[PDB]
Amino acid sequence: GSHLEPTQLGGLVTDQLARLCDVARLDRTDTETYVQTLATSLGTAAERSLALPPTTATLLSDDHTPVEYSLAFLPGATPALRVLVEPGWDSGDLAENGRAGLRAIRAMADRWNFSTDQLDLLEDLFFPVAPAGPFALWCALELRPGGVPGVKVYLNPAARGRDRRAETLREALDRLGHRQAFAALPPADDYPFLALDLGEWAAPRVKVYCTHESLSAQEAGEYSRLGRDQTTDFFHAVAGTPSTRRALTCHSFTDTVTGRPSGFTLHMPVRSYVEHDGRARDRAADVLRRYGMDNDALDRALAAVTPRPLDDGVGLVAYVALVHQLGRDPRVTVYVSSEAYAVQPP
Ligand SMILES: CN[C@@H](Cc1c[nH]c2ccccc12)C(=O)O
Numbered sequence: 052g053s054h055l056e057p058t059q060l061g062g063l064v065t066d067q068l069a070r071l072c073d074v075a076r077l078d079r080t081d082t083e084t085y086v087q088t089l090a091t092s093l094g095t096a097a098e099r100s101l102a103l104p105p106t107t108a109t110l111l112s113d114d115h116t117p118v119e120y121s122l123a124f125l126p127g128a129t130p131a132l133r134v135l136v137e138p139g140w141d142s143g144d145l146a147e148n149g150r151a152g153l154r155a156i157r158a159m160a161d162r163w164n165f166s167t168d169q170l171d172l173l174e175d176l177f178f179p180v181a182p183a184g185p186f187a188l189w190c191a192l193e194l195r196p197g198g199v200p201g202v203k204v205y206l207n208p209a210a211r212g213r214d215r216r217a218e219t220l221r222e223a224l225d226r227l228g229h230r231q232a233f234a235a236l237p238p239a240d241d242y243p244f245l246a247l248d249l250g251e252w253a254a255p256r257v258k259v260y261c262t263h264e265s266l267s268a269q270e271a272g273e274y275s276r277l278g279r280d281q282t283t284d285f286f287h288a289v290a291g292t293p294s295t296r297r298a299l300t301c302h303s304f305t306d307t308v309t310g311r312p313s314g315f316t317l318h319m320p321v322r323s324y325v326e327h328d329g330r331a332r333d334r335a336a337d338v339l340r341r342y343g344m345d346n347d348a349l350d351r352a353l354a355a356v357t358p359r360p361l362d363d364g365v366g367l368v369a370y371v372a373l374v375h376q377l378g379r380d381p382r383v384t385v386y387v388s389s390e391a392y393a394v395q396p397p
Pocket residue numbers: 110111112113119299318320369370386
């Protein structure tokens with residue numbers, strides 16, 4: 052059973068996650084495991100009344116819910132379900148938030164027998180005494196069949212101040228053995244996130260995010276070099292095309308030798324391009340359909356999250372991403388908001 056009520060943050064999010072597990076076709080056992088894993092990872096936030104304001108005005112989601120869901124669609128397969136959580140969200144300040152987040156990661160490492168050595172290597176870079184914003188630690192859980200999830204940790208290159216973003220990112224990549232990766236990164240307006248895979252890997256795997264305030268379809272195609280035409284068509288499809296849009300690229304480095312990324316993702320914040328979620332869902336559905344992906348599952352996933360009409364707001368479909376990975380089929384990922392605190396109006 053569950054100690055959480057539907058008036059509590061944990062009750063709402065576990066209900067949403069359980070329904071999403073059905074869309075992902077996870078069995079009852081795995082579903083129970085992951086609903087409990089989410090509740091535990093939220094800590095005291097799980098029991099917080101939804102009537103109180105969000106403890107932290109987090110960047111994780113627009114309405115400051117410390118959870119966001121995503122579904123990764125591959126051609127002809129049921130989508131894979133992931134959840135992003137901020138374990139330290141119910142804390143008073145950023146330093147306490149980060150401490151609680153690291154504690155959560157350590158508990159996961161103990162439970163699932165993986166090492167935090169690579170993460171520990173970076174602690175002084177990303178968790179200083181008086182950290183800067185906008186966040187401290189997020190955790191992405193890939194909810195795989197079997198009940199043992201994939202785990203990634205997200206860290207803030209601006210933790211030691213905005214002026215040290217590049218210095219911090221470059222020193223982290225160096226410590227991790229990725230001494231040529233920075234040179235592979237496109238021009239950017241921010242380095243909002245560094246992600247580290249945690250698990251059974253003898254060498255670090257990292258993902259570097261770049262914010263582009265005014266990215267063009269042509270530039271997106273350029274940066275996808277690890278392909279160009281699929282990335283440009285995706286840009287137009289999701290952007291609905293003015294000539295430039297705000298977007299993020301992710302650059303995944305899975306070996307330390309070449310300095311070349313093995314993965315590239317274009318993340319399009321569709322919620323910023325459309326009037327309401329009816330339009331955002333339309334564009335995501337069209338992209339999935341064109342790629343031969345499970346577009347019916349998208350509709351079921353949205354309904355699993357909220358029963359509201361899609362046109363009654365915007366931001367439920369937070370992002371659509373095109374994921375390229377050497378040696379794999381392209382993937383489309385749709386990011387879906389919890390809306391535990393607010394529905395942004397059209
Ligand atoms: C309000 N959400 C933040 C962080 C974020 C959540 N999910 C993402 C997916 C892709 C890129 C970023 C994000 C933002 O929009 O930047």
